[PDB]
Structure formats: C-alpha cells, structure tokens
Amino acid sequence: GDFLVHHAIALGLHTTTLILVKGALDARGSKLMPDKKDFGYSFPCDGPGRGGTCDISAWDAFYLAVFWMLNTIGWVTFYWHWKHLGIWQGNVNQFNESSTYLMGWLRDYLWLNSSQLINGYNPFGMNSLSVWAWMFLFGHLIYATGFMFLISWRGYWQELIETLAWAHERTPLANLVRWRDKPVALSIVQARLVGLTHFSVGYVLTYAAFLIASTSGKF
Amino acid sequence: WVQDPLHIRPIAHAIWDPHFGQPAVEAFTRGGASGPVNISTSGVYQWWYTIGLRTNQELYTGSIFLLVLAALF
Amino acid sequence: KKVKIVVDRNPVATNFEKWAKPGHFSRTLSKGPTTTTWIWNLHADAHDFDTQTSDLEEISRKVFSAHFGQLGIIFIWLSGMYFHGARFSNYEAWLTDPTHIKPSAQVVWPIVGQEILNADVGGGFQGLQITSGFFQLWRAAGITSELQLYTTAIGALVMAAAMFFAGWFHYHKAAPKLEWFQNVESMLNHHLGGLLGLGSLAWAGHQIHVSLPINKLLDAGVDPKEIPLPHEFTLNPELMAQLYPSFSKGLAPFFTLDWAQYSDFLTFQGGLNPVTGGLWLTDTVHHHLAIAVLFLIAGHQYRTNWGIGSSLKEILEAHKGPFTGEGHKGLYEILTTSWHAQLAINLALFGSLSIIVAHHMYAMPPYPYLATDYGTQLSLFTHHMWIGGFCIVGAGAHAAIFMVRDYDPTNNYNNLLDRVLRHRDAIISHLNWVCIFLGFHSFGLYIHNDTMSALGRPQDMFSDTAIQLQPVFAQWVQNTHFLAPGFTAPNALASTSPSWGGDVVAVGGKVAMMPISLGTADFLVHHIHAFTIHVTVLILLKGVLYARSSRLIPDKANLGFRFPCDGPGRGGTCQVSAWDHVFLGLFWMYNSISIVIFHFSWKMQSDVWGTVSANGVSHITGGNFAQSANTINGWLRDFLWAQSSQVIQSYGSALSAYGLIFLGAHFVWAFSLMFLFSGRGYWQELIESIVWAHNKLKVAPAIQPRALSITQGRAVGVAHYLLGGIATTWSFFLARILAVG
Amino acid sequence: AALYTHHQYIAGFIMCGAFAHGAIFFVRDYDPAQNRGNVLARILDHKEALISHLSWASLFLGFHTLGLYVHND
Amino acid sequence: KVQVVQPVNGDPFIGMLETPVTSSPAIAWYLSNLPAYRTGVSPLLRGVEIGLAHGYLLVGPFIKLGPLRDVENVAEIVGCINGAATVLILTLCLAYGAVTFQGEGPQVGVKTLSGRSIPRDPLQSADGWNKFTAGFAVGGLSGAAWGYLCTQILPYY
Amino acid sequence: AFTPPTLQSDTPSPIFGGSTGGLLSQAQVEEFHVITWESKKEQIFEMPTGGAAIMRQGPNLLKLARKEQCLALLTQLRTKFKIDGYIYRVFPNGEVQYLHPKDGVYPEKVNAGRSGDNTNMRRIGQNKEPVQIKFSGKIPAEF
Numbered sequence A: 001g002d003f004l005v006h007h008a009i010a011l012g013l014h015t016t017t018l019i020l021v022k023g024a025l026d027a028r029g030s031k032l033m034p035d036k037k038d039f040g041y042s043f044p045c046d047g048p049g050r051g052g053t054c055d056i057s058a059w060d061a062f063y064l065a066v067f068w069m070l071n072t073i074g075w076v077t078f079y080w081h082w083k084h085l086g087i088w089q090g091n092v093n094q095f096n097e098s099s100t101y102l103m104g105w106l107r108d109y110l111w112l113n114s115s116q117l118i119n120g121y122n123p124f125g126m127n128s129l130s131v132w133a134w135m136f137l138f139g140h141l142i143y144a145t146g147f148m149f150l151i152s153w154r155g156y157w158q159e160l161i162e163t164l165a166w167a168h169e170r171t172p173l174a175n176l177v178r179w180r181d182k183p184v185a186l187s188i189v190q191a192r193l194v195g196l197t198h199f200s201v202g203y204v205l206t207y208a209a210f211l212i213a214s215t216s217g218k219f
Numbered sequence B: 001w002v003q004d005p006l007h008i009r010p011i012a013h014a015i016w017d018p019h020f021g022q023p024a025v026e027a028f029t030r031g032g033a034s035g036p037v038n039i040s041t042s043g044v045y046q047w048w049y050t051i052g053l054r055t056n057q058e059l060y061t062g063s064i065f066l067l068v069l070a071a072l073f
Numbered sequence C: 001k002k003v004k005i006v007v008d009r010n011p012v013a014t015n016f017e018k019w020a021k022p023g024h025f026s027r028t029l030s031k032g033p034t035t036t037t038w039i040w041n042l043h044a045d046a047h048d049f050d051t052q053t054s055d056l057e058e059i060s061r062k063v064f065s066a067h068f069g070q071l072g073i074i075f076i077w078l079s080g081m082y083f084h085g086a087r088f089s090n091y092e093a094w095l096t097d098p099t100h101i102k103p104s105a106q107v108v109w110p111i112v113g114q115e116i117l118n119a120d121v122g123g124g125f126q127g128l129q130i131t132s133g134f135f136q137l138w139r140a141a142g143i144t145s146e147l148q149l150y151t152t153a154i155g156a157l158v159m160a161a162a163m164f165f166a167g168w169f170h171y172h173k174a175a176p177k178l179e180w181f182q183n184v185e186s187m188l189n190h191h192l193g194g195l196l197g198l199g200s201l202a203w204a205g206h207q208i209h210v211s212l213p214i215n216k217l218l219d220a221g222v223d224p225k226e227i228p229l230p231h232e233f234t235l236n237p238e239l240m241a242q243l244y245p246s247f248s249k250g251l252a253p254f255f256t257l258d259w260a261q262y263s264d265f266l267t268f269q270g271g272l273n274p275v276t277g278g279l280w281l282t283d284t285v286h287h288h289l290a291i292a293v294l295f296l297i298a299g300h301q302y303r304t305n306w307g308i309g310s311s312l313k314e315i316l317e318a319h320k321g322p323f324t325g326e327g328h329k330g331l332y333e334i335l336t337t338s339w340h341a342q343l344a345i346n347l348a349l350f351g352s353l354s355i356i357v358a359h360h361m362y363a364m365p366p367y368p369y370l371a372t373d374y375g376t377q378l379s380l381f382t383h384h385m386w387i388g389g390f391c392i393v394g395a396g397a398h399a400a401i402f403m404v405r406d407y408d409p410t411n412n413y414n415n416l417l418d419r420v421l422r423h424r425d426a427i428i429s430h431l432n433w434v435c436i437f438l439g440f441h442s443f444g445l446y447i448h449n450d451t452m453s454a455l456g457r458p459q460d461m462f463s464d465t466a467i468q469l470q471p472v473f474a475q476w477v478q479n480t481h482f483l484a485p486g487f488t489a490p491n492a493l494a495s496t497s498p499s500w501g502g503d504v505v506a507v508g509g510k511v512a513m514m515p516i517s518l519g520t521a522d523f524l525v526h527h528i529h530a531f532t533i534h535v536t537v538l539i540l541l542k543g544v545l546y547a548r549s550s551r552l553i554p555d556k557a558n559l560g561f562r563f564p565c566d567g568p569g570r571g572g573t574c575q576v577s578a579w580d581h582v583f584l585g586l587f588w589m590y591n592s593i594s595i596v597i598f599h600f601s602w603k604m605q606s607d608v609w610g611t612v613s614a615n616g617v618s619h620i621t622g623g624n625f626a627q628s629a630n631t632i633n634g635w636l637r638d639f640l641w642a643q644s645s646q647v648i649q650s651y652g653s654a655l656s657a658y659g660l661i662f663l664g665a666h667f668v669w670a671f672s673l674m675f676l677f678s679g680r681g682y683w684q685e686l687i688e689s690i691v692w693a694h695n696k697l698k699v700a701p702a703i704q705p706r707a708l709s710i711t712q713g714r715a716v717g718v719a720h721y722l723l724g725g726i727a728t729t730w731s732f733f734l735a736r737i738l739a740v741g
Numbered sequence D: 001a002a003l004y005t006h007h008q009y010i011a012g013f014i015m016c017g018a019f020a021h022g023a024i025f026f027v028r029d030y031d032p033a034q035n036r037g038n039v040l041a042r043i044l045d046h047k048e049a050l051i052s053h054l055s056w057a058s059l060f061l062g063f064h065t066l067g068l069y070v071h072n073d
Numbered sequence E: 001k002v003q004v005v006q007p008v009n010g011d012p013f014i015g016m017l018e019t020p021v022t023s024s025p026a027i028a029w030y031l032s033n034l035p036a037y038r039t040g041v042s043p044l045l046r047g048v049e050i051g052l053a054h055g056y057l058l059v060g061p062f063i064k065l066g067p068l069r070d071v072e073n074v075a076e077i078v079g080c081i082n083g084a085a086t087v088l089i090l091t092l093c094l095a096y097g098a099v100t101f102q103g104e105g106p107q108v109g110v111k112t113l114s115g116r117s118i119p120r121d122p123l124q125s126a127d128g129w130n131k132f133t134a135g136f137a138v139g140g141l142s143g144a145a146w147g148y149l150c151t152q153i154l155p156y157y
Numbered sequence F: 001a002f003t004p005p006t007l008q009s010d011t012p013s014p015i016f017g018g019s020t021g022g023l024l025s026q027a028q029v030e031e032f033h034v035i036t037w038e039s040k041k042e043q044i045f046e047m048p049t050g051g052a053a054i055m056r057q058g059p060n061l062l063k064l065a066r067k068e069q070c071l072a073l074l075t076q077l078r079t080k081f082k083i084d085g086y087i088y089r090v091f092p093n094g095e096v097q098y099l100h101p102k103d104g105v106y107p108e109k110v111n112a113g114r115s116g117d118n119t120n121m122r123r124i125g126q127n128k129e130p131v132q133i134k135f136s137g138k139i140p141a142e143f
C-alpha cells in the first residue's frame, strides 16, 4: 500500500513540476506565440486565431499547476492521516489491506471516518462537532461556487449584466439611484483567479474540518 | 494543562457569539472553562511547556514583549 | 396544389466509392487530414446536412433515410431484448412467482472471475438482475411462454431489415420530392388518426382478445402452462364469454348503441388491482379505445385533396390580437421550410412528455407486479427524467440553430417572433430576477435551517415543528382528487392513484402504493425544483434570444451558431455563442434532474416503499425525510452517506459491478474537469514539446497533432461531466435499491 | 495531524509560488545577452527535451499507478 | 386594430417601450404622485414621507420573525432593530450622496413627454440629497417609533 | 478633393415599431452614433439591436449607441443591398464628427494621402527585450 501511494505521490509531484516548468520555460515564447514575452507574464489570451490560444500565458500554467499541487498534497495528507489513524487505534491491518485498492480508500477512510463529523448537528441535537460539520458543508459550498467561475467564462455574464443594466435604467423610483462605475463582467484572468481562490479555500476548509473532526471525535 | 498534559484539552480562546443557542453554549464548554471555548489544535501548549513556560504570567509577559517588539519594528 | 405522391427515380447510385473517401460530404474536408482537427471535424459535421448542401430537398431526403436507419437500429435493440428474455432469462419461472423471483435477463461468461455477477435471482437461474420492466410488460401482454418472445425477436429482426431497406430505397431508388415533405396537413391527418388512433385501437383489440383473459386467469391463480393460448381466446367467444359474459352477445350491442352491455370488460373503476398492484386492464382497454376514437376524430381537421378540412396557415394567420400586432403570420412558412424549428418544438414537447410519463408511471403503476418492484420503479422514473431533460436542452439548442441560420427578417415583420426579439431585454431581465428570488427563497431557507441546527436553535428552523411552510395548494388539490369518486366523477369507483389519499395498497407483503403526505420538506424541495428549472430556462432562452445579435456583439449571427468567442476584447467574449449557452444549460439541466431524482428516491424510500406487518408500514428509511430533508446536512448524511453503504460494500458479491462503475464514474467526472478548467494554448505548447521529441526520433506523423478546439474542449468536458455524474447516480441507485428492495 | 497537514499545504503553495516567480523572472528579468552560453541559456536551449521527459515520466507513473489500482479494485 | 404597445414617446430607437403597464393613465398618475417624482417639492419633506413609510413597514418582519418573537418584549426589541436598520440605510444614503454629487458638469436638459422643458430635479444635487437624507432619518426613526405605538394601541391587532 | 459631408437632421428614420435594445442613458451623457444611407426602394432590413425595420425610399437616418453597431449595419447594407452609408459621432453638447469613410474612400482601398500611423519598420521578433525597457511605462512594441 505504501508502495502504491508513494508512486501516486511521485505522479503528483512530477505532473505539478511538469506544468510549472513548462510554463516557466515557455514564458518567453513558443511556436504558437513566438513573441509571448512582449505580452508580459499574465494576459487573457491571444484571440481565437491560429486554432485558439486559451490559457497560453505563464500565469495560466501556474493556475493549472495549483490544481495539481492541491491534488498531490491531498494524496499525501490522505496517506498520512489514514496510516496514523490505523496506528493510533492499534489496527495497522486496516490500512495494510484496504489501501491496495481505491474502494478501501473511499469506504474504510472517507466514508468510515465521516460518521461523527456529519453528525455534529442533526434533527435530534448538536454537540461540539457541529462547528466542524458546518465548516465541512461550507467548504463544499465554496468549492462548488468556484466551479462556476472555472467552467463559465466571460461572455454570458457580460450580456446578462447588460440586460440587468437596461432593467435598472428603466425601473421607476430606482432610476433616482445611479451607479458610479459601469457594471461589467469579471475579466478572464480575474475569473480564473476567483475560481482558483474558491477552489483552494473550499479544498482547505473541507479537509481541515474533516481531519480535525475525525481525529478529535475519536481521541 | 501543565499538571495534566494527557487528560486536559488545551484551550485556544473564548467564544462570544450572540447567535449561539443554549445547547451550543453548553456544548462548547469543555476544558473546565467558564463558558464556550475553542480547543487548541496548533500545539502551542506543548511547545511553550517544553521551552520552560509554566504560568500565565510568563505568557502575558511574552505577549507584552512581542507587542513592544512589533511596535519597534 | 393537390396532395399527391411525387418521387424522383434513382437519384443516388449504390456503391462503395464514397465509403473509401472519408469527408466526401463536406467541401471544407477536401484538402485532406493535414492536422488532427480534420478527424474531429469529420464526425462533428457528419449529420449537419444543412452544411453539406444548400438544397432543402436533399436535406429532407437525408433526414427521411436517417429516420429509417434509426428505426432499424431501435428494432434491432428490441429484437435483442426479446431474444435475451427468451434465451437468457427466467421469465417462465418468474411468472409462477413474481413476488419472490427477481427478474434477470443477462448471463455473463466465466473468464476472469466475473461469473460472480450471476446472482441467485431465483427459480434455479443465475444472472444479472434487470430493472427495465420487460417482465412486467410481457406479463401484461400475456406472453406467458418463451417461444412467443423468440417469435417477437425474429419479427423485430425482420422489421429492422425492412426499415433499413426502406431507408436505402427512399434514398437511392424512390426519393420523395420537397413538395411531398411540405404536406403538413396530410402528415398531421395521418399521424393523428392513422398512427396514434389506429395504433391505440389495435392495442385495445389485442388487450381485449389476449391480455384480458390470460391476465384474468393469472390473477385468479392458474399455472401459466395451463392457461389457454391467445388464439384460443381470440377466436373462441365461448371461452372468452366464460371469462367475460358480455361476449355472449357478440358485436350486436356495439352496433345497436347499447354499449352498457360491455361494462364488464370496459370498466371505469380506478385505483389499482389488489392482486397484482397495477392498474385494471379493463380500465386500460377502455382508455385506449376512448383515446383511439378521439385521435381518429382529430385526424380529420386539416384540408387535403377535398374542400372539407381546415388550413393550418389560415388558422395561424387568423389568431392576432391588439398586444401582438400581426400575430402568428409567418409561422407556417417557418415550420414548413426549416427542419430545426420543427426539431426544437418536437424535442421540447417530447422531453416534457417523457417527464410526464415518469410521473404518471410511478404514481399509477400500469403493469402487474411493477409497483412492488422498487428497483424497476426507481430505474424507470430516473431514466425517463434524464431522457426528458436531455430532449429539452436539445430543443433549446435547435431553437438557437434556427434563429441563427433559418431566420429571415423579411418574412418575420411585426409578428410574434419579431415582437419577442424586440423586447428580449425585458424577458431576460425579469427571468434573471425571478431566478435570483427563487434561489434566495429556496436555498437560503436550507442554509438558514443548517445554521439554526448548528447553533442549537431548532425552534427557529423552517420545519413542521417550528416555522411551518405547509403546501396548502398541493394538499388541497390532493384532497380534491381523493374526494373525486362519487362526486366530481360519479362513474368512478376509486381515485386515479392511491397517492391522493385513502387506504394502503400492498402486494406480497410490500407496499405497492399509499398516500403521499406533503409537508415543509416537500415545499422546500418543490421550490428548489422550480428554481433550477427557471435557471435552465433562463440560460436556454437567453441563448436563443441573443443568438443573432447583442449589445456586446452586434453581428453575432455572422459568426455563426457554434464559435468559441470573439477575441479577448471588450473585456472578454468567451462563450458568447448560442452553442455555449446550450453547453451551460446542459450542466444546469443535470443539476435540476439530479435534485429531482434524489427527492423522488428519498421520498419513496421514506414514505411509500416498505413492508406491511399487520401492525403498520415499515418504510425502508423509517420516514427520516420529513425530519431531515429540511437541511443540507440531512441530505448529505441521511441520504447520500446513509444510502451509499450498499454500493461501497458490494465488493465480493453480485452487485460488485455497481461498486466498480460507481468508482469509474467518479473518475470520468473528475476527468472532465481537466477539459473544463484548461485552455487550448497550454495543450498546444505541450504538444509542441512532445512533437519535438517525436521528430528527434524520426517518428513524427504527417497528420500534425493539434489540441482540441475550444468548442471541442468544452464539448468533451461537458460530455464527460454528465456521463460521470449520471453513471455515479445510476450505480448508487441500482446498488442501493437492489440491496434493500 | 493538524500540524503535518498545515505545513504540507503551506509547502505546496510556496513551491507553486517559487515556480511562478521563476516564470516571472524569465519573462521580465532574463537578458539573453548577459547570460549568453551559461547554464540558463543552455537549459533554455533544450527546454523541449526537459518538458518531453517530464511528460513521459508523468505518463508512465499515471498509467501504471492507475492500472495497478484498477487491477486491484 | 388598436396597438397597446408603442415606442417610448413615439421614438422607436430608444431602449424602452410604452405598454399598458408603464403608460397606463392610473399607473402613471399614481407613480407620478409619489414623493420621489416631485420636482417642485422640497427634498426634505419628500424624504420625511419616504422615511416614515419605510420605517413603519420595516418593524413587522422582526416583530413576527425575530429571534425573540416568542417573548412579550418582542415589540421593543424590534422597534430598536428597525431604528438600527433605518440608521444603516441612512449612512447608505449619505455615502451615495457624497460619492454621486461631488462634481459639476454641463448636463443635457430635461423635457416632459410632450416636449416641455423642465429643470432637473433638485434632489439630484449635493445639497438636495443632503436635505433628503436628513428628512429620511427623522421620518425613518419616527416611522419605527410609530410602529411600536401601533402595537400598543390598535384594539384589533 | 474630398470634404466630410455634413449631417442633415431632416433625414427620416426607417419604419420601426420600437424595441428595448435601443439607446440608453449613455447617449445622453457620453455620445452616440448616427448612420445615414440612401436606398433606392423601401425594403425590410435587420437592425443590430434586434427586430426588423423597413428602410424608406430615399435618405435614411438611424441613431445607435456604439460605433460597432453602425459599422455592422453598414456591412449588412453593403453586402446585401449594395448601399453605401456614412457614420457620424454625436456628442451631447451638439458636435458631429465624421467617421468611417474618413477620406471618402473605404479603408480597404488605398487612397494615397493617408497617415501611416502605427507601422513599425522591423519584424515582430526584432522588438526590444522586456528587461531593456524596465521601469518605463511602455511595452516593447512602442520602441
């Protein structure tokens, strides 16, 4: 089990390093964009020409590498927590036998150690673990919210905001109130940053709540 | 916690939340505190206990010293 | 003028010359596969007949032949189903014990330990438990024997061959002309009476002479091998009279207008059969006969080759009011010359019909021993819900396609379409506001309940114990339906479904149907459904209304229907086309249907499905929905976490496959994220480095590898996301229902 | 557990920042004439080999780790 | 033959349309008689009326739904809550006035639907908004205070 | 010998029933554009703001918000009805500025007498390095 998980860790590290190194080495320019250095470190793209240039700047490479870093750290922490969970309870056989397949990881670690956490508050009452259950759902919500900025792109929101602006400029009583800044949709790079921030915050909060609630409700 | 480092849960800080209900206030009282508190999880208790700190006066003195150091910086 | 059969002889030669030339249908795919993008373009435009030719006649001919091919494929699938039910099933054994033997129609070969999937369903048979409901359908039809299933399979193969021959004949030998396809009046007259009406009448006849006697004997209790054959009942009024005395009078009462005599087999009872748990077959016969007469009468309204009849154009142009200017003028020309508009209307109504079918089927089980089969019920409901949602999204997509290609301003002036396009801002703004209001007042309630429960204040929640949100309107309608028999339906002996109220209908110790009480949780989930449906409608409608132009891009129609963007200018125009609106609508539809199926599953497992022990009803989950569905934590713990133990503990058993797919789907879904959060530039540069590595060893391919286009990347991401999510829910639902049902 | 997880997540974020700033350096402070022929210019001269081998190692590790896990499942 | 939907003031190239919801005689009269659309009335008085109405209608929600709704002293707590809400929306009005009105510019004229030239609303000025904000505070606080009195009085309630 | 043609305020507008995608409040405090063309017959055309209008027989005037809308309408007229139009920019103060057919000759056609603005005499890769222009609010393309 340690062999397989260590190779998974090697995978995460190699892929994260590949993304970061590729972005750093191709930051000055590539075949698709020979003069990338003239556009700076961060820029939305280079237009839909030449087949498409979405996520071509070095900033975008770092952006894509943050996901892989979170995944690698998640694998590392999952391994450490499960091994120590079995060691603290004097049952190394659980990890020695269930870590060789993914179903053991999902059933004997995630589903098994989440009973007390999700029971912090229920239709019967609440205990000191309710804060961790609320933080668990909070992290899930932030992560899913980030999925919006990650999947939806700037175009749909610009038209929607234009429609909203028309509605405000034509609604009586509310016409007396005006906006000092023209409302516009988030920038492409700004949207990627907001989505990444939400993803990372939800990831960290969810794992922190689960980790503390699982190792605290038992010991 | 110094007297019983294995049978007492460290306290991080107090909790003053007007939204708390009676069951929440009673459920967050643990390490012999007067009211709802948060159980420490950063390990500052073990570190401070290992470096020689033993009373609350020493911790307060260290906090004041760090405050003066921050102002100096 | 004058509806007639106009056809062109031998228009296309039959040979394999074009089979060896991929991309022959497209003009842009003639320069050969210089890059890998050509391969994807070859499949992305194979069925886009509008681009392959500018002639409507050729497009119509292609559509007709494609329909024939699809019919042949469906017939092959049906033949396979019947053949498997006749050779690799336990249908004969299941007939003798339909309450304990679990239906199975698939057997796996022993190769790598997979023989464990052959579960001990019953009746000395081993195989995979099926949830398609074919056994119940066959029993309702009176199949009884396996030879009949084999005969049906052979007939289906013959029908498939006939369908394929019809497509080839209509595309290469006798191809109909454009004027033949534009006969909407004749087509509607034939599809209303000659298709629906005639089909309903034929099914009613079969039910009268085959389903009624065989099923009556089965219900009364008779060995399936002892019941007389269908022809012995269809051609012998004496035996059929022994089962139904009204038949001793023959057809005389029908022609003498004394239909009351036929009240024994043409009843209007209601409810469900207490023996089988399904609808009364006599009631279904009466229903089919009535709808057949109605459809046959309706198939005589449109004018054809005679003076009598109505004109669709005349009726449409005559419906104009003071608020719509010109009215429906121009709609006939749009629906008689654009295939995309017809496809949009048909897809929308078709998906809505599928959803209605799912509702009516779980509410009123139409087949014997179907309600007590929880696995089949849940599977059928979820499957039809997904089909309906997909069809609706497709309807929106094709509406946008028509607005982009077939729209013509010179033909739509001051009509309904023009007036709608002239105030799209108001429609979109109001829909956006209603979506925000629904989201707040629907999800914020759950969040408020979660916060109160976590704060130790259950008395401040929106539950049946604290602030109640009773659905008074739904409860009133339900009670009205319960009190309908003998009052607002004197000739009805019982309500349409036991869900409206009344006693509990249980078959074989299991609850087949029972009243479904609605409370605060039902109110919350219904508003959640309304909110999700509204958001999906907002996305699709916005794409259809702004597919041509917009304030940001005034010439969006020139860019086409499917384009990635319009550059990074104006702050960003990513996903501004109608195709992208459909791409987002797919995600929202998945979310809506997922919540709908989750609500149905939890509600039926907590307030309907269960066992009767002479002391009450023991539901599967004990009724925890009424006390936990008001919070998100309850859905995560009491539904997702509690019911997932069946799929995560299936390893080493027959349901192990469900445990494997459950994980596999989770992978595919996550895989989709790679294509949803990435861009084309990164992959193109990475491919550049890999190409350098290949060139260093003289192994670079001439078909220059290229990263998937922006649109293709989005399509792959959405396809994988929905496949993974739907498959995960499928595995979870099937494993849970097959382990506790 | 909390300390280990906290420090590992901090390390991951800091590593990502290190590579991000390295890219920023290449796009804003690197001078090819001042580093003509040294280790930087040479490592940039064969960046394709580096990226190709990183991709091969990642593909190998992923293929085999996932294959072994799926086989066991 | 009648067309109830016409372009705004006959101009078909302005982002607005005249419908029986916007150009209805009764609707237009009621909307025009509101304190917000009184170009000739002092902004302070209009603000007082608006604040009175808003403050009075803002007590109810906390009275019947506040955390202490099941206690006899709910009316007082809610009166204070409405006062706090009025003070908050008061600082909101002040911030909006300080940001919106901070400069001058030769703006375009304003005319009626018939074409009669009218001066710009005095409320859309640095001093006009300040007077309106002050009236909203007095009216808003008075409305909340009256909300508590109505609870004590009103024989039906 | 070309002079910018003056904008006539007596030009009638095309027959349109009205829409919600027209001018907003930006045209009252910022600017708007006007496109005037000449049609040989009364015919239905598609407006950039949604809907369908009818251009009269003779001079037609249409006021839009952005210049892109006017250019899109002009492109539609040129590629569908073979009609040439003129675009002007109008400010709230009352100033009209000629636009698109700047010198009477379309930009796609060389006129010999224009300004060769923004035309570097080097290649795309011959620009100065970003490190050589550091601490200067300029990009390598402006050197």
Ligand code: CLA
Binding pocket: C012, C013, C014, C015, C016, C017, C018, C019, C025, C061, C062, C063, C065, C066, C068, C069, C070, C073, C164, C165, C166, C167, C168, C171
């Ligand atoms: C052996 C009989 C035969 C032959 C030799 C041809 C030959 C030809 N046909 Mg034709 N056709 C036939 C039968 C035949 N057809 C039948 C039975 C139908 C009714 C469905 C049609 C309907 C039809 C249409 C509408 C059109 C043609 C066209 C053509 C010409 C070029 C297209 C082509 O064949 O590309 C090669 C096609 C294939 C190699 C196979 C197509 C893909 C199949 C049908 C998919 C089947 C689904 C299958 C179950 C897989 C799906 C699930 C899977 C993922 C597991 C070509 C000369 C086209 C034409 O005239 O060009 C302008 C034209 O548009 N045919």
Ligand code: CLA
Binding pocket: C063, C064, C067, C068, C071, C180, C181, C183, C184, C186, C187, C190, C191, C193, C194, C195
């Ligand atoms: C009573 C007359 C009649 C009947 C029964 C049908 C039946 C059908 N038509 Mg059709 N049609 C008719 C008249 C009729 N049509 C006329 C007069 C016109 C010209 C205006 C059209 C033009 C038309 C078009 C353009 C299309 C259809 C299509 C269809 C099929 C829809 C698939 C479906 O959902 O049904 C259920 C499927 C079945 C019940 C499968 C069983 C099929 C059996 C054999 C019914 C065959 C009926 C047929 C008309 C018999 C005469 C053919 C004969 C010369 C051999 C369906 C089988 C669509 C299609 O899919 O193409 C094939 C389609 O594209 N029809």
Ligand code: CLA
Binding pocket: C043, C044, C045, C046, C047, C048, C049, C347, C390, C391, C392, C393, C394, C395, C397, C401, C562, C579, C582, C586, C719
């Ligand atoms: C009667 C139903 C129907 C019909 C006849 C059409 C017909 C058409 N559609 Mg359409 N559509 C439909 C329903 C339908 N659609 C629905 C329900 C949706 C919502 C999802 C859409 C959404 C849609 C979009 C967004 C687009 C079309 C487009 C088109 C046109 C080109 C299709 C093509 O050749 O692309 C190629 C077809 C394929 C590549 C087949 C691929 C099948 C998918 C990707 C795989 C799914 C996996 C499958 C479920 C099995 C999984 C197992 C797997 C592991 C092996 C064509 C005229 C395109 C167009 O340009 O219109 C002009 C367009 O972009 N459709």
Ligand code: CLA
Binding pocket: A141, A143, A144, A145, A146, A147, A148, A149, A151, A152, A156, A160, C431, C432, C433, C435, C436, C437, C438, C439, C440, C443, C444, C447, C535, C538, C539, C584, C587, C588
């Ligand atoms: C869980 C993640 C998530 C969330 C919360 C949302 C939320 C929303 N989406 Mg979205 N979406 C998501 C995922 C998510 N989406 C993903 C992954 C995709 C990719 C397919 C999309 C694609 C998408 C599209 C295409 C659209 C939306 C739209 C919307 C908005 C609908 C309006 C509404 O619901 O009213 C109310 C808002 C909510 C219920 C969200 C929760 C807010 C809570 C309940 C209020 C809490 C108050 C706060 C705590 C108090 C302040 C505290 C202080 C510290 C700040 C809404 C804000 C639509 C829109 O623009 O609106 C019309 C729209 O068209 N989404």
Ligand code: CLA
Binding pocket: A041, A042, A059, A062, A197, A201, D013, D014, D015, D016, D017, D018, D020, D024
């Ligand atoms: C000693 C550490 C250090 C230092 C001094 C810098 C310094 C710098 N960085 Mg850098 N960076 C670092 C570490 C560091 N970084 C690390 C660890 C990462 C990996 C995450 C990055 C990744 C990074 C990127 C991608 C970029 C920089 C950039 C920059 C430059 C401009 C920064 C800026 O614009 O400020 C602005 C500061 C912000 C916008 C704050 C960000 C908001 C955070 C992320 C949201 C946090 C929300 C919070 C957690 C929510 C709580 C949850 C609760 C509500 C429930 C600057 C010289 C930029 C640059 O060089 O320009 C070309 C650039 O693009 N950095």
Ligand code: CLA
Binding pocket: A011, A015, A018, A019, A064, A065, A067, A068, C667, C670, C671, C672, C673, C674, C675, C676, C677, C678, C682, C686, D055, D056, D058, D059, D060, D061, D062, D063, D066
């Ligand atoms: C579970 C989700 C998931 C998965 C499986 C992957 C997988 C992969 N990523 Mg990715 N990534 C993801 C999420 C995911 N990512 C997300 C959310 C992001 C943020 C947007 C990224 C961002 C990202 C970047 C920036 C990069 C990668 C790269 C890679 C590849 C690394 C090479 C490797 O590991 O070899 C192993 C290969 C696999 C594990 C794929 C599985 C192989 C399949 C299962 C075998 C096929 C068998 C069967 C025939 C299936 C076909 C059936 C079908 C025909 C019906 C790899 C294929 C890097 C890369 O391209 O490497 C060169 C790269 O640069 N990823």
Ligand SMILES: CCCCCCCCCCCCCCCC(=O)OC[C@H](COP(=O)(O)OC[C@@H](O)CO)OC(=O)CCCCCCCCCCCCCCC
Binding pocket: C319, C320, C321, C322, C323, C324, C325, C327, C328, C416
């Ligand atoms: C809960 C009900 C479910 C439906 C959702 C309702 C919300 C939608 C609101 C959007 C309105 C947009 C106005 C369009 C404005 C518009 O279309 O123009 C006015 C429209 C045009 O009619 P014409 O005079 O032009 O008629 C000529 C036609 O042949 C050509 O269109 O006439 C109408 O009033 C339509 C009715 C709209 C109102 C629909 C509500 C119907 C009530 C149904 C109540 C059901 C439950 C109670 C039953 C007891």
Ligand SMILES: CC1=C(/C=C/C(C)=C/C=CC(/C)=C/C=C/C=C(C)/C=C/C=C(C)/C=C/C2=C(C)CCCC2(C)C)C(C)(C)CCC1
Binding pocket: A024, D018, D019, D021, D022, D023, D025, D026
């Ligand atoms: C002592 C000892 C030993 C030895 C060891 C060794 C000798 C090793 C090592 C080590 C190492 C060796 C480590 C490392 C690490 C590294 C890293 C982690 C990296 C990095 C880098 C980066 C991040 C970069 C950045 C950049 C870029 C990219 C651009 C330009 C430049 C710069 C720099 C800015 C052993 C254990 C055996 C045993 C015990 C004892």
Ligand code: SF4
Binding pocket: A044, A045, A046, A047, A048, A052, A053, A054, A055, A153, A188, C564, C565, C566, C567, C568, C569, C572, C573, C574, C575, C710
């Ligand atoms: S889709 Fe967005 S990121 Fe991609 S090329 Fe177009 S504008 Fe740039």
